[PDB]
Symmetry: D5
């Protein structure tokens, strides 16, 4: 269609539309157990996470009513911090969100919040530890 | 159809009809997480709540055997009391329903009750904290 | 519910509502092969057709845009003209459609039309050749 | 069909047939939350309960292996004790069942039992507190 | 249940009641391609046809409005006239139906009609050419 | 969501999205046989068609590869020409579509084309002969 | 089919086959509540248990890794220990199983174990307390 | 299970059982468009055709009412004659079936007969032109 | 996974594997009516056709039993020959296919063949007339 | 398809692909209760476990983030150590994985683990105690 971001599947848009204030969506990397965890699965194997996050932030406001609307997955000790978080931070600040609302959950904590999320979008993102949890806010 | 309100959808009327004494129905605003909470989902994305409440009250009696047959979602203290509540109130009293039956639920409590409800209709009501739970009476 | 005839079921009211101008519904007697002809089946095995026709006529205008809004199934020339037709004619008139709209269809014509109808209603009408096809009109 | 009562529906018969020793079936009045409680829902919106109870008892024996094979719904004070109970009792004896088998569950207890029942039939019964639960017996 | 013949399964009785006037049902021996022909399939692999025929004709009237209300499968010329046809005739007479109504179809016509019937019941009947096609009549 | 017309329901947007070039969609009025004709049914019982037409024209280009990308349902005499057709014509021109693309179908023909359409949306439009068929055009990268 | 007991239905064979070591299948008499207890239901309404048990014991080895691979339903006083238990033991002995493997479960314990069984088959066995639970062993 | 050939899956045996006189099942090599042509699809991707032909010939009698019970795919007039046909012919006379019942179809005719067949089993057979159509006969 | 091209969704791979000789798959551009035309629909809204074509040709042989294993959609009138046709041509040669196997279909004929294809994959390819139909060959 | 192990079924490949880091898959022997334990069942009745394990190890890396990514079912000792274990070890070491990751689970613990596995693949492995639980690692 005209005016809608080009990297959003028909089904993704529907689920973004039907999501209400408080509903969470996981943007999972190519390595995340998306199918096994998901309440509702959306497959987007041909899309990396930076470009997808940008489009969703364009469309979907974030929950200001909580302290933490965005969550990443904290690494296991010995593993390196993915540099991709810098792209996320750069993007998140872009659509005028305060970077303070990001918090870090550990692997098992993350796995569990994704199960309670309304949908997981399986991406093709190769970067390790690239999983993002987004919480929908109120629409103006 | 003749003699039936024009803003009650086919599927909404079916579900109102099959509802029994005690069953609850949520009238959710545009911002409510309707789809994620619904046991049974009706979308009326083009209808506003006062208008839909009016039609529902005409058709469906409210539960006399409980202290509270109506619930709103309570605001965070001490934020502004939603203006539309007045509209609702003036319509609830009118169908002959005592205002002292309305009750206010914490966001979390409201969510939990909506999951146990028979159905949630998702409306286009743009106003905040505009949600309502209704409990069916006897006919 | 209030203001809605007590002899119209949840599913029947839904289908009456979603019917539009021209759609046909079949009030079928107990002997009619409703299930095998039905595009969409609605069972009301405890209801008779007089009651039902009355309630339906109350909510749903007939099709003014054709010669025939109503069709009974004809007998096999001409053994015992069914008494129940008389009861139908009384209601159909003073509701208030013109009795001249009723045409009578051959068995195999009726069967065939009933398959092209939107829905059939299986009733408990024990009378013979008691079936009816009604055509929805324009609501204004 | 011949030799089968005319007011029990196709899916109703299959249901009574497939029930076995110990299974319960609720015959619910027009005000019961049948749809929302039913494990399995049979709709008979045109039928009243006394005629239905008569047909079922004809086909289905009641459980002798428990002290209560029938339950009614008790009134909340101050509602009227419905007259229909008298019709029910009069009809339950006359099939030969000892009226001592009838017990009286309060509203909330009744709902919870109907939930663990194999099937609920939503009737057209207008009388209040006209709900019945029947427990299937042994055949031989 | 009480008053229902013991060899009519729950789903068979249902389909028998769902059937209207003119509807056909095929009683298929254990060599018939039941599953591949059936619009709707009922399996009674442990039942033989003559006893099934008895119960069905007991419960269901035959179509007395057409030339043939019953069809068997004619043998491929040469092969023996199956004995069971005798047993069927002594079954059909009794229940008061005239054997003049039995017509005989050839394999590829018997297959064709069975596809258009409302149901095929697959039985355990080991005898050859034991297939019967039944047409439902009026219930009064 | 932001930047999306607020009268386009979640399922309608999906179906507008999954439509490609040549696909058609029917905006059916309240009296229309939407449910019986529909390959794929979307119910928007609370929406009027001019509102919906503006939002759809905003997002979805019309098919330039055919003469008629828009069809109305012609009247039988003596029904009146509906006023809403002006409203539609006003709307269509202004999104940049030549009114020459509008053609008119006999009630009967309209029904049959609606059965071959990708989707019918049932609206709350009480105005008569208010049905439209729109045929999706190519979306070209700027 | 050749070389396959005639009294095993298409769907029963498949269930027996997809059962692994330790899975249980219940052979239920005509009075049992099979439909309501079953995780997976197979209907063999025209077959008695004796015949069926023989075929199943011909095809399916019994679990030798537990104390008891066969459970009958024990009676409640004062009912009679049914004669069919005699018929069961050889077949059972006759297929080579040590009868000490038969353990007896009371009514409620039987229903609960059957709810946990991979499948229940509803038979036509009019005899009482004829239900049997079988536990599949290892093949070679 | 005991007394069942070991290379027939649970679903294959069921489909082999529910087939009746005249039904056709296709044994398709790894390269055959099984998924697209199948009315009913059974997958046996780890199984070669000769051993499957063995078991099926053992369990399933072939149709004697036709001159041709078996169809191979004939080669494209350019391609080479497959070794596997000799295997097949030897397999076919071993059970008492005359090789004169074998016929050969050109791809087009083969594709079409397969669509009209009750089932296609997609096998792992590597040999080209390895496909077989078997038509079931009567069990006595 | 290791060794599988990174831009193939789990479902596309399945589709590719279950396709056999002669089956056709349509790589559809972002303007194609993919959903209304597809018998089986795989969405890859995040992939462009060149990268998809490349990894598909790696896995899947083309049908050499026909003059044309590849079909493009010829432009109307009218507009330019898209440059991506050069890109496809450079890839098709290199994987070892004779470019003469490419034929060009009029818009309506392409649509019609795609209705007959096993599957259509909806890509995010923004180039016009970028659609490709591939026919599967034999393997190894 | 080319470059893909020949013993991986279309849905198995899909399953392996849709699995993510941490997801488990049971390779279950012919005696295992796959059907009854399986959250998601893939049937591969024709295939043995070593050839299948080998192919899967080629495609799927094992989880490095736990102390044990491979589990066998331990013997009831009771029975003796099955020789199929060494064959497994020869394989998993040949794929670069350290044999100190194999743990051993008791029969009941293995059943429970398998219920919580993403998929169970039912094999034709005739070796006893031959079941394997693989846990998927990260792909770099
Ligand atoms: C160790 C982590 O496992 C998770 O499942 C993945 O989603 C992360 O990228 C990372 O590999
Ligand atoms: C803050 C509240 O969030 C809720 O989910 C909404 O339903 C209310 O309208 C309000 O926006
Ligand atoms: C002869 C007629 O057949 C029809 O199917 C029935 O609906 C009528 O009642 C009558 O029996
Ligand atoms: C108070 C009681 O509520 C129940 O649900 C109904 O079944 C009774 O008839 C009565 O209305
Ligand atoms: C030759 C005939 O084929 C039919 O399909 C069977 O139903 C008959 O019993 C007979 O065997
Ligand atoms: C007479 C016409 O019937 C059609 O079905 C409707 O869609 C038109 O709006 C009008 O009412
Ligand atoms: C009392 C027992 O009830 C059980 O459900 C039945 O299976 C027995 O046959 C017996 O009637
Ligand atoms: C050329 C032939 O194509 C067919 O589809 C396949 O089934 C044969 O094995 C062979 O490859
Ligand atoms: C005119 C053509 O229509 C087709 O459906 C599209 O796939 C092409 O890219 C082009 O736009
Ligand atoms: C005793 C064990 O039981 C399990 O179910 C099987 O999977 C093993 O192979 C073995 O037979
Ligand atoms: K996708
Ligand atoms: K809606
Ligand atoms: K009903
Ligand atoms: K059966
Ligand atoms: K398989």
């Amino acid at each position: 269609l005209k005016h809608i971001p080009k990297n959003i599947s028909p089904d993704l848009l529907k689920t973004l539309m039907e999501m209400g204030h408080g509903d969470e969506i996981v943007l999972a990397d190519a390595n995340y157990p998306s199918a096994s965890c998901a309440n509702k699965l959306i497959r987007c194997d041909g899309v990396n996470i930076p470009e997808l996050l940008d489009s969703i932030l364009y469309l979907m406001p974030l929950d200001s009513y909580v302290d933490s609307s965005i969550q990443f997955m904290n690494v296991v000790s010995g593993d390196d911090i993915p540099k991709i978080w810098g792209t996320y931070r750069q993007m998140i600040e872009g659509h005028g969100t305060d970077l303070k609302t990001i918090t870090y959950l550990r692997r098992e904590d993350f796995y569990e919040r994704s199960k309670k999320a309304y949908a997981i979008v399986a991406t093709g993102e190769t970067s390790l530890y690239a999983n993002i949890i987004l919480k929908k806010g109120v629409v103006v």
